[PDB]
Amino acid sequence: KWKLFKKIGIGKFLHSAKKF
User: Fold this and answer.
1) Which residues contact 3 (CB under 8 A, 6 or more apart)?
2) What highest taxon heads this organism's lineage?
3) Which helix or strand (DSSP H or E) is residue 15 part of?
């Protein structure tokens, strides 16, 4: 019920922020 599936990348955005 939000911009999750339309932007699941946000969840993986912190997995990418963990690489930097």
Assistant:
1) 10
2) Eukaryota
3) helix 9-17
For Cα atoms 10, 14, 15, give the angle at the middle one, nearest 5 degrees. 110
Structure-block tokens of residue 3 = 């911009």
Structure determination method: NMR
What angle is formed at CA 16 by the lines to CA 13 and CA 6, rounded to 5 degrees? 25
State the Cα–Cα distance between residues 17 and 19, nearest whole angstrom: 5
- For 8, 19, 20, the CA distances from 11, given in Å and listed in that order, are 6, 14, 15
Give CA–CA dist 3/5, Å, rounded.
Answer: 6
